[PDB]
Amino acid sequence: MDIILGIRVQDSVILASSKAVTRGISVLKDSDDKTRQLSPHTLMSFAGEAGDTVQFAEYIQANIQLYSIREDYELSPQAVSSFVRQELAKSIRSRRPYQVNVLIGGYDKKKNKPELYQIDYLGTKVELPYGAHGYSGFYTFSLLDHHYRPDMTTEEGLDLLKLCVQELEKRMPMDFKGVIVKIVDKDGIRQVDDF
């Protein structure tokens, strides 16, 4: 289970993603960044089958970067999420589907609002205040159902996120080797180097 979490607060979106890469019986790496910057104000985390995850993320990244150059304009998070959903919805009826689940965290510069989209490998899109893929949601959703507000600050969002990670580290069976946390706001994307 490749833990990926997301929380949308007052003025930003926070994505947390596990660092472990386990192939069989061995943890091959404990510092893996399961995310790609699609545009300056849009970040996508991902989790699923080996190989497919990175291949899909980089493919999406390339397409959005192509759009940005062509139009000299950044697509809204809503527009990027719809593009991503269609690719997955197309993929599910292919010969060999992309087995990838994603969270898209973005800051809409037009509306001055943070936005979090959860999309699974079938192409099921939902906009949420907080989201998760895989087994993480079984612990974190109910926990966030209790501790979330729409008017929370970024610092309160991080404390709330620490609470989620602590619960996961206590009750989940695999060692996912901690998480890399990234914040998406009006100023762009930045990584929290100490978590």
Binding site: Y130, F138, Y139, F141, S142, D145, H146, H147, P150
Partner: protein, 212 residues
């Protein structure tokens, strides 16, 4: 199904939901997942309804026979082990049971045993069992402290079931609360989720995922 039980300063809190399902069909919203074995013993029910009901009422008969023969009450350890040894005989036959045997005695103090149809018997301070265990664990674990008040502890257990009733499709209906002390168990009422959810949302300011 969501059931929990945890040890704290004022004894034990036991909280359960009330839903029973058959596939996606909600068969009952008013089932009793706590069994009053004796004035100081409680049993929780998760998994097969019949299996849990039948063998835990059977357990009460065995505990009663113990105190007739030994002129002394049965320990929580001995009671839990009667049930675990029984299901171990049936192992492989297809019984489906996830139970907590909660109680108090003088020599043990407040005690909780997790008993399983796989034969697993575990002593511990906190347990959540059923299809909604993960959801209850999330709330319970993040707000648990050893020094809660009988009032705060009762609420936490109630709140943890509510959390799971909300997110878990196969849990819901209502919340049955119990509190176990030196002097036995004490019922703390049936709490319909249809009213409790909105009450908690308003008073606590949580559940912002919902349109209200």
């Amino acid at each position: 199904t969501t059931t929990l039980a945890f040890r704290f300063q004022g004894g034990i809190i036991v909280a359960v939901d009330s839903r029973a399902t058959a596939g996606n069909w909600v068969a009952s919203q008013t089932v009793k997942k706590v069994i009053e074995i004796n004035p100081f013993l409680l049993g929780t029910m998760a998994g097969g309804a019949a299996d849990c009901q039948f063998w835990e009422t059977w357990l009460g008969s065995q505990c009663r026979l113990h105190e007739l023969r030994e002129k002394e009450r049965i320990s929580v350890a001995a009671a839990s082990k009667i049930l675990s040894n029984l299901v171990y005989q049936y192992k492989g036959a297809g019984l489906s049971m996830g139970t907590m045997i909660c109680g108090y005695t003088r020599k043990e103090g407040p005690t909780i045993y997790y008993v399983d149809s796989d034969g697993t018997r575990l002593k511990g301070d906190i347990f959540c069992v059923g299809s909604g265990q993960t959801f209850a664990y999330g709330v319970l674990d993040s707000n648990y402290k050893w020094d809660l008040s009988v009032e705060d502890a009762l609420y936490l257990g109630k709140r943890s079931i509510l959390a799971a009733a909300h997110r878990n499709a196969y849990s819901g209906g209502s919340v049955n609360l119990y509190h176990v002390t030196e002097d036995g168990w004490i019922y703390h009422g049936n709490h319909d989720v249809g009213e409790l959810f909105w009450k908690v949302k308003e008073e606590e300011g949580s559940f912002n995922n919902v349109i209200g």
